[PDB]
Amino acid sequence: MAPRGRYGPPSRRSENRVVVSGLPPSGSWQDLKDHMREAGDVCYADVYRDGTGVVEFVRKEDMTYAVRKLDNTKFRSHEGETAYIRVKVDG
RNA sequence: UGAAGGAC
């Protein structure tokens, strides 16, 4: 998606970010959108390969919704396993 | 996170 082969804003940018912690080592930015889609129209995510990452939606209200209904609930990844996530406000 | 995105 609109690559540049160099450092910079990855692909979808944001406005209303929230952390996603407790994530399995299987997680990635690609799978975070494929699941927070429940909370709303997530458009960007980022991952730190260490059990933490971030995600954002087209509307800031869908974000606080993702850390009140999609916090402390199941999440899934391409590796074939699942774990809870502890969404946070941002950091 | 050696530098970005659909990676599988």
Q: Is A21 helix (H, G, I), strand (E, B) or coil?
A: strand
| Phi, then psi, of A34 in degrees rounded to 5 | -65, 0
Indicate yes or no: strand B within 7 A of the C-beta of A28. yes
Q: Is the CB of A34 under 7 A from strand B?
A: yes
The single-letter DSSP state of residue A25 is T
Residue A34 CA to residue A22 CA, distance in Å, equals 17
Three-class SS state of A59: coil
HSE-CB for A25 with a 13 A CA cutoff: 0
Method for this entry: NMR
CA of A29 to C1' of B7 (A): 9
Long-range contacts of A1-7 (CB under 8 A, 24+ apart): none
Q: Return the beta strands (E) in A29-91 as ranges.
A: 42-47, 52-57, 73-76, 82-88
Q: Which residue is nearest to nucleotide B1 (CA to C1')?
A: A48
Residue A70 CA to nucleotide B2 C1', Å? 34
Going by C-alpha positions, the residue among A49, A50, A51, A23 that lies closest to residue A36 is A23
Do residues A14 and A66 touch, judged by C-beta distance below 8 A?
A: no
| Length of chain A in terms of residues written | 91
Q: Say which CATH class A15-91 falls into.
A: alpha beta
